[PDB]
Each structure stands twice: as structure tokens, then as C-alpha cells.
Design a protein that fits this description.
The structure is cut from a larger assembly and holds two copies of chain A and four copies of chain C. By secondary structure, chain A is α+β, with helices and mostly antiparallel strands. Chain A is built from one helix and one strand, in the order E-H. The longest helix of chain A has 7 residues, at about 5-10. The chains are: A alpha+beta, C alpha/beta. The structure holds adenosine-5'-triphosphate (3 copies) and magnesium ion (MG). Chains C, D, E: Keywords: ATP-binding, Metal-binding, Nucleotide-binding, Zinc.
């Protein structure tokens, strides 16, 4: 199952 | 208090008319065998009159003697937890 | 698609004629003719605002070709820490007069002019306790100088504020109180919601004892909760594909409250 | 330097799909589609803010050529003793407008305009109890007037603050509670950190009974302690050259709590 | 000296055909045939003056036989606290006419005469908020009396000025917003800057994950910073005899901001 | 990288919102230093009590550790003309009852004794002069 880097989520954001 | 709250033995009470009297002092009249409901009286023209019944928010279906509420409060203060 | 029309309808809003609304309108019409100031009090989900809007939409602004509109009833709602110039700003905008820069005495003199020119008979002030204490001087002024029935609307907090000043309490003593639904009146109102507002294609028979043990416990008799709980249970039931509400799904919705 | 790369990685942060995050997103979609205001509550290390950032970082802003952004979900966090202007200032900045000097009503009017312009469906307010008591008038207003689901996030003190205003209490009544891990759920979660978060070169077998006693007494079931204990033990044990966590080195980290 | 050629190049300016520029020109072309006044808004480093200037370099003056020059687009930037005379002086001078010792009501009439004579279709007023509040009566008079589209260009303060007057707000109600770069659009733009603007003999490959982290932090999406930073890194690097920009020299630049 | 706040309990209760905010927003460790009263204040808010749990504790000197430390005061801080031999059992009994294991009393008692000693003309501390200083407590 997928787990996310909190900084990748920031980089992918609007 | 603001929003019609009363505080008594650590329990917070609200009731059907209290918010209109915020800042006034009321005589709580209570039964030590079950403090989950309190009668609230106020003074008008130097005559004490009945105001409303106040109920400890979120435990209206329970019962608590004043001794249970006091002993549990000491355990919470000793434990260091919020009340 | 059939479902998506019902899901749009259920998320909308309507005014149902109820006894408490009918009882307010027949009291406000008396105060409008007699020019008496008064207050509507009650708890925070009894539907006071819908009853006052339903009244504003009865007496519509009458129009004559070249004149300011004849507006019998004004309804306004103040912002928090409302000052005298904020109250006057809103009464002037409501009557469709644009508000220019000026001092408080300019705003006062202009508000007093437009209230006369539009022929106002009643001024309904919602959430009256957002008013700063000094503004009540201007509210009593409007009501003694002009023939205007000022209605203050609010929760019991309002009276706690009002009792701080004799001068106001005495203008605004006459009151109508909104209460909670019970007994036959709660039971009958649930059937009005089922037929008139939910319009589900299989009857949910919500007046049955097992459904009313859920609704009476969860709504505590408030019309605000009854509209919210039932629309949510209807959205959730139709989006799951059932043609009516059922005991477990209404339990799932009521568990959150 | 392979060690220094792991020390730079492990002091970082991640989001894991857990049941208490998947549950929140299914619930918040329900509130967003139905436009119903509500609150999320629970003890301070349950990870409510990560669960809400995982919501904000899904549902990304949509861009249309030269239009203002369409922003389905807004998450803001207020400063201490937040006044009406500070709430409006932050909502305006989050939708990417610069806020120019004005009176409180200029900030109010501009905020209502950008919320309605950016098509906002939901407003999430973290640490809601930093709000000054009067500002809730403006939060109730945003939710009454615009079709916006306001979500308040806080802990058990927030309820002690909400219960001081009947108007807020009867609106923000629907709620979800974040709880602590136990039994099989704490056991299963420890394996997810070992295999998805820590990335140590050999299995540390953290779910074994001799190790779960150590971790249970340390963490009390809080996800915010579990991530903290297991990052600190990984950082420390790699700086001593082991490929694992073991009984004595974990008891060294847990003896700091 | 080959090196002295390159530093003289990087110090200058150039226009890159960004989607946002294309989006403005396509929108203003609708407004130019329709003859509708409008405004362009956005943050100060987003490209607005350059995007407007590129539209002025399209639609350059015609000169058929025996006629005045036809000048479809006029563009001006007022100075600060620009009065009614100074606006007319700029419109007259942009159209190459000399002007001699007028009172303001001569400057007004000579401006209306050259705006008719040159066949002006559009008037782009950059930094519109430098206008004194009274000059908008002359801008509305130009826009109503002539068949001219006025485009006010500016920051979020421009809105604050316009909202102070109903007369203006309504002539200029329509709008387009300039916004910052993000996601794949920032990455594509950095790749375009490298090959289009920098042109160093060896590739720096700045779309590489490690380098976009430095630029995203350093620039925060403004097209302004992105350009300055990439130029300053090419200049500094070239002065030290390097063939490329690299990781260390780019961090040396970005730290100054 | 690190912010250290001494006497943390002088902070007004609301300021902790700003202390937590920084610690969470910026990669900055915040260290709160204080007495047992600090924890009595901290336990008055869950939100704070959980960001700052880890705790190192400073104790009192005892046994061999107090005895060994007395030699360091003699050979590195005092450096008197000839040696007072403060590790001897009778001088340790006087010092133990005086200081109660606190390093902030050991530093104080021995300066007060050494100043008296030198200003009266002694090349060292002795039983009676140290008892004169310790009797002030
Ligand atoms: N007669 C009614 N018909 C339909 N919906 C109603 C009626 N009365 C109340 N409601 C519904 O109840 C909810 C709350 O009603 P309302 O806003 O009037 O409460 P309120 O008394 O105004 O609250 P407050 O006192 O804080 O202003 C709304 O969803 C409203 O549509
Ligand atoms: N779902 C998750 N996946 C990964 N790490 C998590 C998750 N939830 C929490 N954490 C970790 O545990 C910590 C929990 O802190 P978090 O801010 O999420 O809790 P919180 O409830 O917001 O605290 P408070 O209520 O006091 O603000 C985070 O810093 C993160 O490192
Ligand atoms: N499309 C573009 N192509 C190349 N350079 C650009 C572009 N847009 C902006 N720049 C550069 O960015 C800097 C500022 O750009 P620009 O002058 O357009 O900002 P602006 O939005 O006009 O500023 P303001 O809004 O304050 O008037 C200048 O160095 C300019 O050359
Ligand atoms: Mg949080």
C-alpha cells in the first residue's frame, strides 16, 4: 500500500 | 457565566433560561445524593423566586453523588489530567 | 438521471407553513398596525429567521413609476461589534440608496430621510445582540420619532444584554417566545416533512414508534435539527439506492449528533 | 555517506494510509457534498492535522486560463487571540490575493467575494480554539450565507470553548472523534512503520511480544509518539552501526519518556 | 573578447512566449473588437507590463497615403499621484504630437481630437492606481465619449481604489487575473529558460530534481525571480571561466534573497 | 537549529502557542529548562505537555560523587597556597551537612570559606573556619 513523503505532497500541490 | 453556564463541584451546568441572566448571582439548590440536576433560584424585589433546572452537560442520563464527584476530582488533580 | 435531481432538491431549502410561523405572523401583523416595538426570543435552532424571512416575503415592496419603493417591512442583520454608522449604512443600502462617505450625523440624517420616504412601518433586527451598547440610542430614536415598530430578534443572551439598561428594556418588553416541539406536535411535523419536503417515492413511515424513538432523542424537538437529520438520511439512502429511509440508516446518521 | 543520508531522511516526515485517515476522508467528502458544518475532535497526538493535510493535498486547486483558481478545500491555521481581521486576512492570502490596509468591513467584504469567486466548498480551521469569541459570528455568517461546510479541528478544550456559545454549539453539533490505537490495531500499525517508514537493512521484528511491551508502555497508543520513538531509535542505532532495533537500544529511547 | 560579448547579452532583456502572455493577448483581442472596457489584475512579479508591451508591439501604427498614422493600441504608465493634465499629456505624447502651454481644458480637447484622429481602439493604462481619484472622470469620459476600450492594469490595490466609487466599478467590472507558476508549468518554464535565454555551450540541465528544489525555494513561482536568478548564475559563472551553471554557484546566488 | 528557553515558566500561558508553532513549522528544536514547578504549569495543557515530553533530569551529588567533586573544587577552582585536604572524613561531614549535595552550595560555601581564610591570613581551610561559614545556614 502507498505511503507519501510530506515534502513530495508539497511539491505536487497547486 | 457567558452562554448561561454555571460551575459547581467541577461539573458545568446549563439550563433553559440561564443565558438571559449572565453576570447575575443565583442560589443553586441541590441534592447531594444526585448532583446531575440542580434547581436554580434568583432574587427579585428581595423575594427569592424559581428560575430553572440546570443539567450537567453530556451526563444527563447518569447519576453522581457529590462524594463521587469530589473523590473522582481529587484523583484527576492528583493524576494531573484535565477535568 | 433520476437520482441526481433528487440529490439536488434535497440539498436545497424550503419554508414549510407550521404553527409557530403562523403564530409569529399573526403577532407581527398586530404590532405593525399598532406601531409597538417588541422582541422575538427563543433558542438557537427554533427557526426564528425563517419565520421572519417568510414575513418579509409577504409584504413585498410596492412600486409607483417615478418614486422610491413603498417598503412596509425592513429586515437587516448587523455584523459583529456593529456601530451607529454600520447600522445606518445597512438600513440605507436595504432601501436601495447608495451610501457615500461621511460622518455619523450624515448617516443618521440620511437614514431618517429614507425611512420616511419609503413609508416603512416595521424594522426587524436579527441577532440584535451584535449591536454595540451605544447604538441602542439610535434604535430607540428611530422608534420614538418615526412611526416604526422595531422588532428585536434573538436568543436568551439578548435579554442578558438588554437587562443592563433600563431605557431599552422598557421600550422592548412585549415578547413572543419560540419553543421546542413535543408530543403530538413533533409526531405531526415529522409526517409533514415526509410528505412535503423529503418526497421519497416509498413512504418511510417516520411517524412509527421505532422511528420516533430515534428522531425525538436525536432532534431534542428542534426544527433545525429535524430538517438537517432527515435531509442527510434521505441523501444517504438515495445515494445507496433505497427508495425510503430505514431503521439502521437513520441510526447511522443520528450516531454523529 | 550512507549513514548521513539515512540521518537526513529519518528526521523527515511521511503520511501513511491508516484506517483513521481513510475514515476521515470518507466522512469529510460526505460533509462537503451535503454542505453541512461539523467538528473533528480528539487527543493532541492522534494525528488530526496530518489527516487534514492528506485531505487538502488531495482535491488539488483547478486552474482555468486567466480565471482565479477554483479551490474546493481551504485549510487555514489561526494565530493566538485571532481577531475578525486575522481570519479574513488569512482566507484572502490562501486564495492568493494580497491584503491591502482597510477597516474590518473591507476585509469581510473582500473575503466573501474571494470565497464565492474561487468556488470554495469547504473551509477547515485548525486549532479552532485560537479564535476570539466574537469571531465565531463571522464563521457562522460564512456558513449561513455561502454554501460552505466549515470544519473545526481541535481537542477536548475546543468543546469547553464551543459550549460557551449556544449559536456555535447547536450548529457545530455533528462530530467525529480521533481515538488511540490498541490490541490488533496497534500491533498491525507497528509492522507498517517497520516495513514502510523506517527502511532499516534487516527486520527489527518490532511486533514481537518482548518488543510490543516496550512500545506499548512507551507510546500509550498515540500515533504521534509511535513515529517519534521509532525515528529517534532508528537515527540513534544507525549512528552506532547496527542494521536493526533490539531490546536494549529501544529501552534507552523509551527511558527518556 | 568572446567573454565580454556574453555578459553584455545576459545583462539585457528578452520576451519568452509563455502561455499566460498568449492568454492575455487572446482575451484583449475579444475586448478590442467588442469595444468593452476591462481590467487586468495580478501580483507585481507575474509578467503584466511585459505581457501588455508585447500586445503593443503587435498592432503597431499603420500609415496609408494622405492620412494621419492609425494607432490601434495606446499604452501608458502614469507617474505617481497623476493629475488630470498629466494623463492627457501622456496620451498626446505617445501619439507623437507636440503640445504647447495649455490650460487643462485645452489638454482635454487636444487629447480627444488626437484620440479620434489616430483611430485608437484601445488604451492600456499601466499602474492604474497611480491615478488620483478625480482623474477617473476623464478616463470614463474617454471611454464613453469615444469608441475606446480602456484596460486598467494593476495589483490588488487597484481593486481597493476602484471599489471606492460606484461610477467606475461598473464601467470596468470585467476582469482577467495573472497568477504565479506551479507544478509541471514551473518545470517546463525552467527548461525553456535554459535553452531559450541562457545558451551556455554545455548543458546545465536544471529540470533535474536536485536543482528544481533550489529554484522552487529560491523563486516561489514568480517569473521575475526565476529570470533574475538564472541570469545572475550565468553571469557569475562565466566570469570565473566555467562552461556551466552548477549546484554550488546557484546556491551562492539564491542565498542573497 | 536549536532554541533554549531558560526559566520557561515565566511564559504567559498563551505564548506557548507561538513556541509550538515555531517548533512544528521550522526544523528547530526547542528546549525548555526549569524547576518542578514548570511541570506543574505544563500539565495544565495537553497540547504542550505532549510536544515536550522527553526530559533529562539533573540530580544531587552523593557518595563517591560528592567526595570526588570536592577534590576538583580544591585542585581546580580554589587552588589555595597549600592543600586543605577537603576529601578528609571530618571536612566531608561538615560539607555534607552544609551543602546537601547541591553544586550551587558547594561553589558558594567554599568561596566564602577560602575568602575568610585568606583575609585572616591562613594558607588553607581548617575545621573551625569552615564550621564558622557553614553555621550561617
Ligand atoms: N418552518 C420551517 N420550514 C423549513 N425549514 C425550517 C423551518 N424552520 C426552520 N427550518 C430549518 O431549520 C434550520 C435552522 O432554522 P433557523 O435558521 O431559522 O434557526 P434560527 O432560530 O434562525 O437559528 P438562530 O436562532 O441561531 O438564528 C434551517 O435549516 C431552516 O431551513
Ligand atoms: N497518518 C500518519 N502517517 C504518518 N505519520 C503520522 C500520521 N499521523 C501522525 N503522524 C506522525 O505523528 C505526528 C502526529 O502529529 P499531528 O500534528 O498529526 O497530531 P495532531 O493531532 O495534529 O496534534 P495536535 O492535535 O496537538 O495538533 C506527526 O508529526 C507525524 O510525524
Ligand atoms: N514573459 C516574460 N518573458 C521574459 N521575461 C519576463 C517575462 N515576464 C516577466 N519577465 C521578467 O520579469 C521581470 C519582471 O517582469 P514584469 O515587468 O512583467 O513584471 P510586472 O508584473 O510587469 O511587474 P509589475 O506588476 O510590478 O508592473 C523582468 O525582468 C522581466 O523581464
Ligand atoms: Mg494539529
Amino acid at each position: 500500500i502507498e505511503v507519501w513523503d510530506y515534502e513530495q505532497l508539497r511539491e505536487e500541490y497547486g | 457565566q457567558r452562554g448561561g453556564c454555571l460551575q459547581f463541584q467541577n461539573l458545568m451546568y446549563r439550563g433553559e433560561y440561564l443565558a438571559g441572566y449572565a453576570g447575575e448571582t443565583v442560589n443553586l439548590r441541590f441534592d447531594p445524593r444526585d448532583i446531575t440536576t440542580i434547581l436554580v433560584y434568583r432574587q427579585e424585589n428581595n423575594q427569592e423566586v424559581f428560575l430553572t433546572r440546570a443539567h450537567a452537560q453530556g451526563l444527563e442520563t447518569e447519576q453522581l453523588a457529590l462524594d463521587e464527584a469530589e473523590a473522582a476530582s481529587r484523583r484527576l488533580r492528583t493524576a494531573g489530567k484535565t477535568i | 438521471e433520476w437520482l441526481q435531481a433528487e440529490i439536488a432538491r434535497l440539498k436545497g431549502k424550503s419554508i414549510v407553513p407550521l404553527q409557530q410561523v403562523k403564530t409569529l405572523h399573526d403577532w407581527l401583523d398586530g404590532k405593525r398596525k399598532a406601531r409597538k416595538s417588541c422582541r422575538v426570543v427563543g433558542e438557537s435552532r427554533t427557526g426564528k429567521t425563517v419565520a421572519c424571512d417568510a414575513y418579509r416575503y409577504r409584504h413585498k415592496p410596492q412600486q409607483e413609476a417615478g418614486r422610491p419603493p413603498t417598503v412596509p417591512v425592513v429586515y437587516i442583520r448587523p455584523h459583529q461589534k456593529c456601530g451607529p454608522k454600520d447600522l445606518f449604512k445597512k438600513i440605507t443600502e436595504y432601501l436601495k440608496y447608495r451610501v457615500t462617505k461621511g460622518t455619523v450625523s450624515d448617516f443618521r440624517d440620511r437614514t431618517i430621510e429614507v425611512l420616511k420616504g419609503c413609508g416603512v412601518e416595521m424594522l426587524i433586527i436579527d441577532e440584535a445582540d451584535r449591536l454595540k451598547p451605544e447604538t441602542f440610542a439610535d434604535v430607540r430614536d428611530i422608534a420614538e420619532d418615526l412611526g416604526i415598530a422595531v422588532v428585536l430578534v434573538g436568543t436568551d443572551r439578548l435579554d442578558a444584554v438588554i437587562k443592563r439598561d433600563e431605557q431599552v428594556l422598557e421600550r422592548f418588553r412585549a415578547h413572543l417566545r419560540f419553543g421546542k416541539l413535543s408530543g403530538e406536535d413533533f409526531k405531526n411535523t415529522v409526517e409533514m416533512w415526509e410528505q412535503m419536503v423529503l418526497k421519497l417515492p416509498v413512504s418511510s413511515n417516520l411517524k412509527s414508534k421505532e422511528m420516533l424513538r430515534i428522531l425525538t432523542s436525536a432532534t431534542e424537538g428542534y426544527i433545525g435539527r429535524l430538517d438537517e437529520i432527515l435531509r442527510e438520511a434521505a441523501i444517504r439512502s438515495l445515494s445507496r439506492g433505497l427508495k425510503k429511509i430505514d431503521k439502521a440508516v437513520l441510526q447511522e446518521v443520528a450516531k454523529e449528533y
